[PDB]
Amino acid sequence: WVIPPINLPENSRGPFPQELVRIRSDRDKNLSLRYSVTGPGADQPPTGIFIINPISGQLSVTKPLDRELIARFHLRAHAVDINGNQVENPIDIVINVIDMNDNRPEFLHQVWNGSVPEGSKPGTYVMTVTAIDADDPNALNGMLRYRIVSQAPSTPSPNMFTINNETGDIITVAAGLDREKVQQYTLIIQATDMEGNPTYGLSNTATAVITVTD
Ligand SMILES: [Ca+2]
Ligand SMILES: [Ca+2]
Ligand SMILES: [Ca+2]
What we know:
Name: protein (N-cadherin)
Keywords: cell adhesion protein
CATH topology of the largest domain: Immunoglobulin-like
CATH superfamily of the largest domain: Cadherins
Helix content: under 10%
Structural class: mainly beta
Entry title: N-cadherin, two-domain fragment
Bound molecules: calcium ion
Strand content: 35-45%
CATH class of the largest domain: Mainly Beta
Strand order of the largest sheet: 7-13-12-9
Number of domains: 2
Order of helices and strands: EEEEEEEEEEEEE
Number of helices: 0
PDB class: cell adhesion protein
Assembly: monomeric
């Protein structure tokens, strides 16, 4: 066998120590054994998180894990005798730090600039804003989707532009961009994670100051 990569959530609350798996050998059913665990998260930075029980072999976490820092741990528990000789070859222990949505979708610029050619056909791409998620790019924890919360001004009338829910590329979908009637628009663009869930997913805003060229 080996040890089926134990998946352990991010930011947990133990109370650490939190036992995971009691790494037992067969030699311990012969010679009395001494266990140790080496790999980052163990001995190597972060110095002290996963620790085995030298006596009982019970692997254990000592503080909550957090992916933005390390998302996965590869460890090796060692078996030694009274002479320092390894009695068994160091077992691999893959500790997957299962993710938890723990941060909003962040934009790359609190303000964004752009412009469209005044009288321009619908479909045109003004600018492209983006916001991402520090997540596990695969989970609706980091999947974003955008949408325009507001438009200023609103004349001729609003609903003039539109962001592609997934990409970012804003597009003018309403004729009449009059550099005279309104020479500068200030769009408020929002991005939410969890593919959009209005409560589950968290969100952010930014501004798309779209300008009307000659
Ligand atoms: Ca985290
Ligand atoms: Ca997370
Ligand atoms: Ca997120």
